[PDB]
Amino acid sequence: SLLLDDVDNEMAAIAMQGFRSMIEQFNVNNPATAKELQAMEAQLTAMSDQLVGADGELPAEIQAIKDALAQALKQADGLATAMGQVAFAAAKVGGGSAGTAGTVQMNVKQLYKTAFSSTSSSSYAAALSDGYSAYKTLNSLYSESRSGVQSAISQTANPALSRSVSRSADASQRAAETIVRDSQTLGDVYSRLQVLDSLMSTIVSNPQANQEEIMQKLTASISKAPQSVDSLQKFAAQLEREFVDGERSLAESQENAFRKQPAFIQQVLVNIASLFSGYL
């Protein structure tokens, strides 16, 4: 009876290819369906057979994915819950601790829940906000994690971030429009929001810095951030024009950053959700 944290490379790649094959069975751009859930099950069984044989005992983490897919067929939360269990398993294969696999699972599951949220939902803004918190948490964890946990994160989170988006004086409103203008997917939104977040963080941490230095440092940070990079650099340059261009703009940006930064980013998220939702 096999334990996933104690697998050889051939079986690690078998498992991960099975997870990748499950992922190809759905389309995040439309509500999840019985057919997709069933197809994921068929891919899971094909990989399980390779792992332990048509009759061997399923490892705990594969058991969990099976249970999850079973429930989702009986009743969005369903596919999202199953993909969190996929990300847990993949994280365990990669040598992650229980705590790490748990964090990966909770936060990947959230990205799918955000991907499947309708823009008309009363909870859409919330879901967009929760999805950014999950994004950040995953990017933090990615950096400090073993390679296989990195693969578990990116391979399960990316499909949710691929969800398409499209649009329907105040700085937070101006930032929202700038992010949205340059974004096709949810991943585009969050990666560009993170650039703004980093711009604000750079100002706070370097209050004496002028425009050129702020941008120099931000550029370095974007180069050192976890994983298109040229596109985020180009986006940084677009933020420069809006919020760092000249002494007046910088002074405005410095007030928001020193005095309001979390509130500002959450107001930006509200305004981004408004642009996708049409609602105030």
Write the layout of secondary structure elements.
Elements: H1 9-23, H2 34-52, H3 60-74, H4 77-93, H5 98-115, H6 124-143, H7 147-161, H8 171-181, H9 186-205, H10 211-223, H11 229-243, H12 246-277
Helix pairs in contact: 1-2, 1-4, 1-7, 2-3, 3-4, 4-5, 4-7, 5-6, 5-7, 6-12, 8-9, 8-11, 8-12, 9-10, 9-11, 9-12, 10-11
Major sheet, described briefly?
none
Strand content bin: under 5%
| Head-to-tail CA distance between termini | 55 Å
The radius of gyration is: 21 Å
Net shape: elongated
PDB class: protein binding
Keywords: helical bundle, protein binding
Assembly: monomeric
Entry title: 1.90 A resolution structure of CT622 C-terminal domain from Chlamydia trachomatis
What this model shows, in words?
The PDB classes it as protein binding. The entry lists the keywords T3SS effector, helical bundle, prenylation, protein binding. It forms a monomeric assembly. The entry is titled "1.90 A resolution structure of CT622 C-terminal domain from Chlamydia trachomatis". The chain is mainly α and 280 residues long. Helices cover 75% and strands 0% of the residues.
Would you summarize the structure shown here?
The protein has 280 residues and is mostly helical. It contains 12 helices and no strands.
Keywords:
monomer; 280 residues; mainly alpha; 2 domains; 0% strand; elongated; CHLPN 76kDa-like protein; protein binding; T3SS effector; helical bundle
